[PDB]
Design an enzyme around this catalytic site. Sequence first.
Site, PDB file in Angstrom:
ATOM      1  CG  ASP A  26      -3.675   4.820  -2.037  1.00 37.30           C
ATOM      2  OD1 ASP A  26      -3.234   3.721  -1.738  1.00 37.30           O
ATOM      3  OD2 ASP A  26      -4.674   5.381  -1.268  1.00 37.30           O
ATOM      4  CG  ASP A  59      -1.818   1.274   1.503  1.00 38.68           C
ATOM      5  OD1 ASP A  59      -1.958   1.925   0.348  1.00 38.68           O
ATOM      6  OD2 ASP A  59      -2.165   1.696   2.494  1.00 38.68           O
TER       7      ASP A  59
END
EC number: 3.4.23.46
Length: 375
Positions: free
Chosen positions: A221, A37
């Site tokens: 992201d 992430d």
Amino acid sequence: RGSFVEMVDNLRGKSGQGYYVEMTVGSPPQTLNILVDTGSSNFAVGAAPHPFLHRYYQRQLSSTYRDLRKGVYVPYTQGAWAGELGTDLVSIPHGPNVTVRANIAAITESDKFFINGSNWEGILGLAYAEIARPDDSLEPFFDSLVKQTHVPNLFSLQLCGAVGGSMIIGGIDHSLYTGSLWYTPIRREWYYEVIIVRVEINGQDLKMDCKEYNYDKSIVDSGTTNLRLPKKVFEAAVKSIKAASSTEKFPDGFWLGEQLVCWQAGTTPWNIFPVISLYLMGEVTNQSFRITILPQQYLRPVESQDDCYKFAISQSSTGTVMGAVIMEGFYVVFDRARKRIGFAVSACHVHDEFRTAAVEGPFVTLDMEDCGYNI
Ligand SMILES: C[C@H](O)c1cn(C[C@H](O)[C@H](Cc2ccccc2)NC(=O)c2cc(C(=O)N[C@H](C)c3ccc(F)cc3)cc(N(C)S(C)(=O)=O)c2)nn1
Ligand SMILES: [Cl-]
Ligand SMILES: [Cl-]
């Protein structure tokens, strides 16, 4: 035969619910699958039974675990978890050939965080300490790796959609992309914040003020599935995408992500949907470049002889989030040492015989320093 060969193909995904890498923690070793992430900055692992977890970290069996005697809670746009901080030895067996002592949050309770069937059991927050919980004093994993070892301060990601891909840590592997890499500045080290200076739908400029495309930030992201756009930009982009794909009509809910449309296996009329381009600020004054994705990136399969799809551009009230819908088109280089992010067309991106994702430039775009939002 590239020098980073043993990190190629080190990511997996189970039916498209997050890309993860194996990480080995503690002594003797406990290997868990960890979601990658770039949108958060805590390294945290399931550390207690949960219905969606197959395996979890057992601190009492690791002789090198050190308790930091502090709790931690992290809320995200989707889901949240709570747990206990400590440190332990961590290595990435198909990553760099080093072991570091990193902070680890042991997740003991969570809400809507783990995803059933995804096969991952923790999260690796690759962004910077400014956004870590409980605060920026909790050094993130990649900062530990760079401080403790010789590994260069860069990593790159190739997320191969439909599920696997590569996380190259400490360099770039030229097999994972075609054409040239083009770089945008990281505006500020917190999230991987970038500046979007123009948006086109099939060649047609949306013509908003660029400050709307960055209100209140635009980030890269990998732990968020969709391309998320601020309210006014999302409403404007949907109106333009509808107008471009007007040879077929779909229910309003399809563009809100509430209805799926299915086609018989193999027949999805990709050509009726437009390409979408985002122009990003370049490395020289007044110069930009553009990345262009296909409906194969923004229409995502949901798993008969039926191919069902959800439209995966959605609304945000916390800025533009270039999630997996963007990243699956591209090899993305997080060149933290030179404070810049590079894009090139991915060698694994999904496309058809008529159209490919693209990274092109240079363009001339004036007054880009006015696009960003100021807190
Ligand atoms: C630091 C900060 O407060 C923070 C940072 N983030 C964004 C992070 O990437 C967090 C990390 C995370 C990872 C797994 C499960 C829950 C959350 N991501 C999300 O909040 C998030 C996670 C997801 C999500 O389903 N992620 C999964 C794991 C995923 C599935 C496919 C894939 F290619 C990549 C990611 C979806 C969304 N959306 C709101 S959406 C439907 O618009 O795509 C948001 N949110 N808040
Ligand atoms: Cl060991
Ligand atoms: Cl998000």
